[PDB]
Structures are given as structure tokens and as C-alpha cells.
Amino acid sequence: GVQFGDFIPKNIISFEDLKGKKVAIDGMNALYQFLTSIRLRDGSPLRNRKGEITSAYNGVFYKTIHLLENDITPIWVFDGEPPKLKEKTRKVRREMKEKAELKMKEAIKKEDFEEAAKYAKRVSYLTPKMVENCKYLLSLMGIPYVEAPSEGEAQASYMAKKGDVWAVVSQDYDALLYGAPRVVRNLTTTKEMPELIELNEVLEDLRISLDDLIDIAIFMGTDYNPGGVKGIGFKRAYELVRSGVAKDVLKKEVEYYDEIKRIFKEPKVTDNYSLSLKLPDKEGIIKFLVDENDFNYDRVKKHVDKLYNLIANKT
Ligand SMILES: [Mg+2]
Ligand SMILES: [Mg+2]
């Protein structure tokens, strides 16, 4: 996401100081994280005997239990319906290139079949099936999840602002742009220590408003305007913001500036979800993990036993 890291205040926090907090996990960010970091010695992903990747299932299972063991109650947040994701104020223009220039012409020729074998790949190793399988596993584990109307980071941020959860868990800083009061990094990955970023601290320290921060992100470049504004990094953007000339510059330099701003300010969110935990289906977990995905029975068994006890106590 936006490379805010070096320019915003952040603090290393211990796992103990995270004890008892409820958090909204950015599901897609977490799953991509697992695929990247849960690999073999040769950098190859974890797979079952059928050659299917299980890296994501490994992180979902073990990472979720790790948090619960430390009294951190997670609620997984996933992205909305790929076909339709227009988030309340997110339909005016596009969510891709469907409406506008996407090219309609007869080209079924070989270049279309080598291509008709060239569409299921850029969806990375994280396929809808895999994402669906992760949702299934969370269900068996008794862990609550929400399917956001659109971007999961907006849903999670909303949940944090509401106070249903203490922070958004992700490796990206982007939740701050949606008004998330707190983001906690390095929980799904522990190379480095957990890192807590508080939005209010960032704003007070930099002496800027949330709208200013969104402006800086747009200069740098968001998923909605990759590459940002020609030759402008954090410092120059922050300079333009403090001078009070950012909004004029952005209106000139970024088409759909007002549209991009609305995405962060008025996303489509939902209140239909529960943070309640359910006792885990031990047998179904073992079938899916051990039987169908070749996880080690012993380790899995000890873990579903631990999971059940934790939830029971919590419940
Ligand atoms: Mg992002
Ligand atoms: Mg996202």
C-alpha cells in the first residue's frame, strides 16, 4: 500500500499489551502475507500431495490460534463480491475497465486460446476458491468473519471507528486513510515486532488533518491512481499540504480526484456481522486440514483441542 512508513509516527508494541483486545483482520492482506512468507526453504509455497497450495490455510489456522492464546479476539474481514463491489459512493466511474476501453473485437484466433488459458493467473496464487476455503476453515474453527460490501480495509476501519474492535490488523497503512483509529502491523508476520500506528498521533505530530493525509497519499499514489502525481514523494506532498496549495494541485493533476477522495471518506460499509465466537468443529477441521490438505495429524489435533478450550473459556 501507500509507503507511509518512514514518515509517520509509529510504536513497537508488545504482545502482552495487546492482550484482551479485539481486532479486525484485513483478510486479503493477511492471505497474501501468508502466501509470501509461509514457504519452503527454496522459496516454494506449501502444498498438499495433490499439488494444491495450503500456505494460506496454514496461516489462517495457526496464526488465529496464536492470537487467541494471547487473549486477542480476531474477526476476519474479506473483500466483497468481485462482480459487484461499487461501495455506496463508488459507482460513478469505474472499479476496473469494464465500462470504458477494455476492447471488443473478434480475436478468438489462437492468440485467444493461449489467452483462453491466460486469465486465471494474475489472480495470483490467491484464487476465489482458496479464499472461499479460508472462509470455510474459519467457520469450522468457530471464528467470526464479515464479507464487506467492497474493500475489506474500509469495512475493518469502519468496525474500528465504531469501537467494535480496537484496531485493524494489516501489513499496509491504508486503513488510516479510511479513518481507522489504529492499525497494528506484524501480527500476521513476525519478522519484526508488532507495530501500532494511532491515527490521532500521526495527525497531531504532523500537524495535518485526515483529509490532508489522504491528499498526501494521492500525491504518492493510491490503488486508485497508481504512480501518483509525477515526481512527488511524501516530503514534497506534505510540503504542498502545509502550504495549503495541495487541493488545487490535485484537482489539476489527478483526474477523478473528488471520486478518489469519496472512496476513502464515504465507503460502503455494513453492520451485519457478529464478533461472537463458536466452539470449533474438531472433526471437520481435521478432515479438511489433515485428510484433504495433508497437515500433520498430531499437530492439528493438539491445536483444535487448544482452540476448543480457549473458545470455551472465552465462552
Ligand atoms: Mg491497499
Ligand atoms: Mg484490501
Curated annotation (Swiss-Prot):
EC number: 3.1.-.-
Any one Gene Ontology BP term: DNA replication, removal of RNA primer
The record's free-text note on cofactor binding: Binds 2 magnesium ions per subunit. They probably participate in the reaction catalyzed by the enzyme. May bind an additional third magnesium ion after substrate binding.
MF GO annotations: 5'-3' exonuclease activity; 5'-flap endonuclease activity; DNA binding; magnesium ion binding
CDD domains according to UniProt: H3TH_FEN1-Arc (cd09903), PIN_FEN1 (cd09867)
HAMAP family in UniProt: Fen
UniProt family annotation: Belongs to the XPG/RAD2 endonuclease family. FEN1 subfamily.
PANTHER family in the record: FLAP ENDONUCLEASE 1, FLAP ENDONUCLEASE FAMILY MEMBER
UniProt function note: Structure-specific nuclease with 5'-flap endonuclease and 5'-3' exonuclease activities involved in DNA replication and repair. During DNA replication, cleaves the 5'-overhanging flap structure that is generated by displacement synthesis when DNA polymerase encounters the 5'-end of a downstream Okazaki fragment. Binds the unpaired 3'-DNA end and kinks the DNA to facilitate 5' cleavage specificity. Cleaves one nucleotide into the double-stranded DNA from the junction in flap DNA, leaving a nick for ligation. Also involved in the base excision repair (BER) pathway.
Protein name: Flap endonuclease 1
Organism: Methanocaldococcus jannaschii (strain ATCC 43067 / DSM 2661 / JAL-1 / JCM 10045 / NBRC 100440) (Methanococcus jannaschii)
